[PDB]
Design a protein around this ligand. Structure first.
Ligand SMILES: Nc1nc2c(ncn2[C@@H]2O[C@H](COP(=O)(O)OP(=O)(O)OP(=O)(O)O)[C@@H](O)[C@H]2O)c(=O)[nH]1
Ligand SMILES: Nc1nc2c(ncn2[C@@H]2O[C@H](COP(=O)(O)OP(=O)(O)OP(=O)(O)O)[C@@H](O)[C@H]2O)c(=O)[nH]1
Ligand SMILES: Nc1nc2c(ncn2[C@@H]2O[C@H](COP(=O)(O)OP(=O)(O)O)[C@@H](O)[C@H]2O)c(=O)[nH]1
Ligand SMILES: Nc1nc2c(ncn2[C@@H]2O[C@H](COP(=O)(O)OP(=O)(O)O)[C@@H](O)[C@H]2O)c(=O)[nH]1
Ligand SMILES: [Mg+2]
Ligand SMILES: [Mg+2]
Lengths: 136, 431, 433, 429, 431
């Protein structure tokens, strides 16, 4: 039943006023600074870019390590194969030479027995010669 | 975020990759000669994401075809859309990987890798705004698995700020090409955990079970399995290929889907499930489409989603349907099944509706879930790996390539830590 | 003159900008080519500059870290209205990551944006300040805006900066990380903004569904409604009005405390264009509708809060006698609790310019309309809902690696959340006796 | 270009080589002069004149057997330089083949292989064909294998070994030559396909109704199996398996490299109407012991790997359906540590038969290669015959006379004991 | 392994040698002039083993004819095939050895030896691939025994890597030329044990008993005995003379037949038994052949094979017969009579079938056994030697030629050790 109407403004395309139903129960009006700065903003944007760049480089360093390992396993397979060859080559030459050695030894032993049979024969022949002619 | 560069490695990678290219070409109205014959502008609005515009007219897939064997490469060229591919983009070695990850990753693979990088660099240098890479491969073989992960690592080094996405096919004893699959898969998972941003876990175990049990096949072929894959690949790439607000690019998809860097293995889902000869059915409503979300039977990974909790979910509806009906049917599923969604990731399920349905279907739904239940897939590969590794079975074929036993121990330890990490979040309360 | 520079950041900011400028040209008789039949207002010069060819060019800059959305402006109906140099785009977006918008990408286009704003400020004889339009949710709307606001405080020290901020709603949301981006931008922008008009996408979505019978509201639906409220707020800057006649007058009338600068907008009437008969709604009915939480632009309960300032902005066929009678009746039936240090009252402004609607739009043309701007402590409920979603995810450090990967420190999340806690404590303390 | 070098050592190796190359020519349409009215290039090189020459070397310490090649139908198919012969044979003595006689021709053989490897752009490795029994097949092969490991390191070397049978045997010392060659070759071979002459003799009698099987009968059947293994390398089929794949899928441990071959179907060129057996029937026949190439009982052993090589009118679906039923068979035990065990090869070309031969033309055939612990029974039988003679040092003087030492016999037998112990250990759980 | 060089020494050596040459010439279609008049190209395939191609169409035996007396060799030139031999190959003395081993080994023999070596070197150096030597001689006389073993030793020295094979005829009191035969035989056995690789033990005792008991010849002559020898020699050389897989050369035969160096004394056997010119009315069956060939009565050594055990056996079947039947009969004999085959030499019996039968017979069988029963032959010579040696009877016949008693003691001791060695293997168990 009360209401206070305080006129504010009046223009060509409008009118304004204030309506007050009740004054403020409490009195004494309502009872900023940054600013910021371009340097501060740049510093934070740059710090963030460096965090982004550091991590991209870290992933890259990890990918580079996998690449080195890839070369290492290829190299490992090369080394195992060369060694295989080396061992097979020496195992064989030792075998071929040992067999040559045993085979020539066997043929020498048998040829020596036949040779001794020849010595024994001229010896037997010497005995007959001493029995024959003498007394005869 | 415009261009995606697609890479296909090995037999599986190229068979599923060829299938993807023929399915999306049909959706974008591109014939097997590269010319556009479609009746709509939505088909061409984001054509640039997967295709290059050739010298006057025609559209050529931004696809690189890779194998250590020439066979599969001939099979693709001879296939339905075989002639659509850039001939210079076919990169093939002469001697395969012999189903050996070590040969694909360190020997034969390492010898062909730079030729592949040269072809990917030419496609990448041509891009106005490269999103990243999409790789299709199997984890059980030698090339797709070993060389594929070698490519991921080499690509990561040259393009560290680009998104690395894969369609990775998990082996299963039910459908196997080789005795050493648990080894090749474990060694690959280790690579994917460290080097990819997003991986769609395509499990041959789940694909087999769907064909046998649900499609009532009997004895299923790669053709049967690849029909489910092509539907899944078309579904999961819809948001990248057509105008939309949700997961419209590789990075925005990763931001919504991956809460922790290592937990980037998605369990894709699809409805309706159909067979190549099954054509014509007519049915499936908005409620029926949404009901498959928690249906273990509709998962392309052999995991039961009700055995874990969803970290994040992307749901894509295709065809002419009410967005009102979709939104409320999606809200109901979440409220009714609140125990399978982590409470500490609010509004973790995102929905998109594309007007263009896939060929054969009037209405369809594709689900992309980052579920803690995916640990079941990794546990299965780990148990198969351990049964072989305990006895050092077939190990000499890997050590013969210069690998150490330690690499095997490290790979499996990393896969077990990943299992422990999903388990940690499955048990997290928040609260 | 008393010129105002409008800045539209990210998709939401740019898209709402399209809706606002389409409506402004609709209110001033400016054709989409910038042509306007000369006829004996001339306050419209605060928002539009003039060229040697007689064309009226908006005093605005449109920014996005991606070209798709702005390319539609460059190609669309209003392409001749803006000069190419005031439409700024990068190549790659901020991917819903505040860190990406603020620290990584933003840093590449900031100087270009500042240079363009400086060129617009040079054409001003009495620059009042800036109106900044953006989403809280997106990486550009959040990250790029806070970067822009900090620089503007450096380059324009004193000059007023007001915001139109899109508060996220899950029904239209594109990212799970929207609460993170919301808190980070609020913390960083807090000391650089003088007055911010938050627009809760759920409140708009709900007004569009109820009042406009739109089953599934689109961005066009939402933006056209938002544009009506912006038009009500800016009308006395663009016409020879009597209340909120300059930017400084927004802080004076609505903002008794620097941090407590988030007024609540309530608009009435919102009527479907395909209704029938009707009406016409009186000054009493539209005034009563100002005290209805359903018509608010932010979801909150003023019954649970206290008013520290209230403005009623009428438009069209409105008489002071009807207004005072309408206020008198409300005081009888409702409490309208003000804080002890403020008088229970209203600063009222009538702008005789009629409410304007977009020709084939969803809104009906009305003879009378009103926007109430009130600084209520109830708006803290909107911050509380946002803070809670932040806390749930932050407790597990969910998605944090995306921000850290961009060079942002985890400590920034703690700093931002602590500032929000102080803001919540400030609203509590302000309404005590 | 994925080339494979075939080496044929001694009579058995050379004679099986004749049967294989006659069949390969028939399969690829190559006339006996090398002319032709692609994959075969892995086994045949080409001359500027358009002639197709086998990537093979034939070796024997005596000229008789190879002189028949130089005089026969396929004279001109081979260049004279790839047909190497000495004057005196190894007289059924491993020691003469390895040292005494072998050392005279070894460098010549290596030089010719080097010249063949020189024409290869992507050499896969070597296929070595020989018997266990003869002095050349045993002694010269062992020497060749050691030298190939020196010249080519770890390049793949696979064998087709003729396991001795008393019914066709020529020497009492065959178990000694068998053990000596197995010991010496063990570390140099990657994968060996043993062919038990008694199993072949019994298939020829049973399945082919041949009263008294001859080497021609045996070799034609053997050639069929060998052609199945090389079919994947010589053709581009529905599913291929290269030399590397054979090794990876069939061998779990370096020493355990002896897969069991089983071929089906073997039907006489006279009769039905056999009823074009289905992929299932031919697959099932692979796990039945009568069709095996080595006499042993896989029901008493455990499988570690199975490679199934299909040829002719065969579809992947039929194969997987047939394998799925094998997976349900409780009676077919696989080891603990093998989550799967299967590897499939499919080729378009049905098995071609020699005009005038004993084998009937079939629409589909299969060769299964399985690594079973049951194959250790074949080593046990050989070891036992070795032990009986060695306990008395019977015939040992023949080897010692050639420069060998009794220590070698002991070393060789101990390696065989470890091989037997290895098959035992690998099969436990 | 092509050429064999044949040597025939002394009376017995030349009589049996002449007989061998006439028998094999008929089998190879060579007439007494050296010209080939046969057919069945099998006759010429391995003609090089025993004959030289004489510039012209002639075939000349690679035979050296040796004696210390002209008698037998004038008798050879005058014999049936006498003119087929190379005239320069006849090496003869005028002295004789007087049935004294010392005269043949040390005196008269040593004086003619170099002339013989002259002729053997010429034949040997002409060879493309020399197998070795075949000597025919008696052990009871002086030339064949003493000079023959001297030749073996001289040839062994010059050709140590060649095979040394002999057809050695053992003396018997039933046939007897002297009292000194036990001495000459013991001294020769000593030489053969040390210097030969393979010896066919042709026992005059057994030959006499066959002629007297089986052939019913009241007073057998050397002609009767030599008919059994020529049949045996033709039979045991079949595998060397015709194309075949089994024991096709001298070294391969020794490898299959000799398990211990000293145990190289073969017990030859034959079926069927016939007298001279007498033919035929009834040809034996395969089952008959395989029984007879393993019977005492059919042995060319006076030993009962059922008194010992077979170390190794080579069985040769001649004539048109079923290989199936032969194989089946040969396996049956071994299973039925397993106690006469050592268990510790598996598959110790080898079988061969030659289509060409010997003249007069439609079907025949030859048995080459390395049996521990041969110790009975050596025990018999040893008992006769000891009866004389104990009394030093006729010893001055040998000491007069320069020999010492020690040589007798050594020879005797070596022959008794050989007996003990066969006994050791006879008693050896597999276990
Ligand atoms: N009212 C309204 N809200 C919008 C509009 N476009 C986007 N939004 C909201 O704003 C948030 C998405 O942020 P955007 O402005 O699209 O993204 P942005 O500023 O371009 O930043 P980035 O795309 O991440 O570089 C979600 O809450 C959307 O619902 C629009 O046109 N109107
Ligand atoms: N399957 C088959 N086995 C054979 C053939 N020839 C010989 N054998 C077997 O191989 C063994 C004989 O060894 P061979 O290969 O003939 O002799 P070699 O390698 O020439 O050695 P030497 O003749 O002693 O120099 C016995 O087991 C025979 O049965 C053949 O053509 N086919
Ligand atoms: N879904 C599916 N899986 C396949 C296909 N081809 C092969 N695989 C699987 O892929 C793995 C073998 O990898 P593969 O690509 O053939 O070897 P790679 O060529 O060396 O990469 C096994 O798990 C096979 O089951 C295919 O076309 N579709
Ligand atoms: N079977 C056979 N034995 C003979 C023949 N001539 C002599 N003998 C035996 O040979 C031994 C005598 O040897 P002999 O060759 O006559 O003396 P040599 O000429 O000095 O060597 C005695 O055992 C005789 O029985 C013969 O033609 N055939
Ligand atoms: Mg945007
Ligand atoms: Mg041979």
């Amino acid at each position: 039943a009360d209401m206070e109407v305080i006129e504010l403004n009046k223009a060509t395309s409008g009118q304004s006023w204030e309506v007050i139903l009740k004054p403020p129960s409490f009195d004494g009006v309502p009872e900023r600074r940054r600013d910021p700065s371009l340097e501060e903003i740049q510093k934070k944007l740059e710090a963030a870019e460096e965090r982004r760049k550091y991590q991209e480089a870290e992933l890259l360093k990890h990918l580079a390590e996998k690449r080195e390992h890839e070369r290492e396993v290829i190299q490992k397979a090369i080394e195992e194969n060369n060694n295989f060859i080396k061992m097979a080559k020496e195992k064989l030459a030792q075998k071929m030479e040992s067999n040559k050695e045993n085979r020539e030894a066997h043929l020498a032993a048998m040829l020596e027995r036949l040779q001794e049979k020849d010595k024994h024969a001229e010896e037997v022949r010497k005995n007959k010669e001493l029995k024959e002619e003498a007394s005869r | 975020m415009r261009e995606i560069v697609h890479i296909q490695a090995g037999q599986c990678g190229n068979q599923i990759g060829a299938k993807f290219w023929e399915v999306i070409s049909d959706e974008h109205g591109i014939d097997p000669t590269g010319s556009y014959h479609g009746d709509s502008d939505l088909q061409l609005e984001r054509i640039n994401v997967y295709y290059n515009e050739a010298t006057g007219n025609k559209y050529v897939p931004r696809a690189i075809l890779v194998d250590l064997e020439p066979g599969t490469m001939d099979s693709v060229r001879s296939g339905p859309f075989g002639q659509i591919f850039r001939p210079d983009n076919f990169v093939f070695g002469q001697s395969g990987a012999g189903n050996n990850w070590a040969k694909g990753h360190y020997t034969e693979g390492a010898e062909l890798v730079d030729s592949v990088l040269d072809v990917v660099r030419k496609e990448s240098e041509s891009c106005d705004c490269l999103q990243g890479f999409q790789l299709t491969h199997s984890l059980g073989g030698g090339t797709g698995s070993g060389m594929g992960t070698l490519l991921i690592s080499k690509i990561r080094e040259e393009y560290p700020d680009r998104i690395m996405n894969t369609f990775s096919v998990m082996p299963s004893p039910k459908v196997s090409d080789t005795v050493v699959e648990p080894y090749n898969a474990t060694l690959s998972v280790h690579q994917l955990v460290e080097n990819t941003d997003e991986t769609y876990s395509i499990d041959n175990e789940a694909l087999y079970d769907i064909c046998f049990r649900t499609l009532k096949l009997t004895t299923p072929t790669y053709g049967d399995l690849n029909h489910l894959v092509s539907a899944t690949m078309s579904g999961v790439t819809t948001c990248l290929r057509f105008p939309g607000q949700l997961n419209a690019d590789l990075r925005k998809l990763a931001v919504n889907m991956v809460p922790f860097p290592r937990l980037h293995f998605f369990m894709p889902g699809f409805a309706p499930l159909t067979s190549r000869g099954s054509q014509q059915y007519r049915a499936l409503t908005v409620p029926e489409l949404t009901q498959q979300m928690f249906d273990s039977k509709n998962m392309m990974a052999a995991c039961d989603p009700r055995h874990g909790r969803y970290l994040t979910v992307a749901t894509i509806f295709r065809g002419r349907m009410s967005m009102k009906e979709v939104d409320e049917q999606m809200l109901n599923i979440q409220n009714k099944n609140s125990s399978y969604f982590v409470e500490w990731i609010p509004n973790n399920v995102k929905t998109a509706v594309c007007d263009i349905p896939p060929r054969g279907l009037k209405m369809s739904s594709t689900f992309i879930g980052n579920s803690t239940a995916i640990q079941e897939l990794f546990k299965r590969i780990s148990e198969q790996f351990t049964a072989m590794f305990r006895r050092k079975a077939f190990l000499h074929w890997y050590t013969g390539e210069g690998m150490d036993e330690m690499e095997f121990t490290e790979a499996e330890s990393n896969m077990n830590d990943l299992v422990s990490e999903y388990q940690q979040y499955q048990d997290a309360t928040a609260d | 003159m008393r010129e105002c520079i409008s800045i539209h950041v990210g998709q939401a900011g740019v898209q709402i900008g399209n809706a606002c400028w389409e409506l402004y040209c609709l209110e001033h008789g400016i054709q989409p080519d910038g042509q306007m039949p000369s006829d004996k207002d001339d306050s419209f010069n605060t928002f539009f500059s003039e060229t040697g060819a007689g064309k009226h060019v908006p005093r605005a800059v449109f920014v996005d870290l991606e070209p798709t959305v702005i390319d539609e402006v460059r190609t669309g109906t209003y392409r001749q209205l803006f000069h190419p140099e005031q439409l700024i785009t990068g190549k790659e977006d901020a991917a819903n990551n505040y860190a990406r918008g603020h620290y990584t990408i933003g840093k590449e286009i900031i100087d270009l944006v500042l240079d363009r704003i400086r060129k617009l400020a040079d054409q001003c004889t009495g620059l009042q300040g800036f109106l900044v339009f953006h989403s809280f949710g997106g990486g550009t709307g959040s990250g790029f805006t806070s970067l822009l606001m900090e620089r503007l405080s450096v380059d324009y020290g004193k000059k007023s900066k007001l915001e139109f901020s899109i508060y996220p709603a899950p029904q239209v949301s594109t990212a799970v990380v929207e609460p993170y981006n919301s808190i980070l931008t609020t913390h960083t922008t807090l000391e650089h903004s003088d007055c911010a008009f938050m627009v809760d996408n759920e409140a708009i979505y709900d007004i569009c569904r109820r009042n406009l019978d739109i089953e599934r509201p689109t961005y066009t639906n939402l933006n056209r409604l938002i544009s009506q409220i912006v038009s009500s707020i800016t009308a006395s800057l663009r016409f020879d009005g009597a209340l909120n006649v300059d930017l400084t007058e927004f802080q004076t009338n609505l903002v008794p405390y620097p941090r407590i600068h988030f007024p609540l907008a309530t608009y009435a009437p919102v009527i479907s264009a395909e209704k029938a008969y009707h009406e016409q709604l009186s000054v009493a009915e539209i005034t009563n509708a100002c005290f209805e939480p359903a018509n608010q632009m932010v979801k909150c309960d003023p019954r649970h809060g206290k008013y520290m300032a209230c403005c009623l902005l009428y438009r069209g066929d409105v008489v002071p006698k009807d207004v005072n009678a309408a206020i008198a009746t409300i005081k009888t039936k409702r409490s309208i609790q003000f804080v002890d240090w403020c008088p229970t009252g209203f600063k009222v402004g009538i702008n005789y310019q009629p409410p304007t609607v977009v020709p084939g739009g969803d809104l009906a043309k009305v003879q009378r309309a009103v926007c109430m701007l009130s600084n209520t402590t109830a708006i803290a409920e909107a911050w509380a809902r946002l803070d809670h979603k932040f806390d749930l995810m932050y407790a597990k450090r969910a998605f944090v690696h995306w921000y850290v990967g961009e060079g942002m420190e985890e400590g920034e999340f703690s700093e931002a959340r602590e500032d929000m806690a102080a803001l919540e404590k400030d609203y509590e303390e302000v309404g005590v006796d």
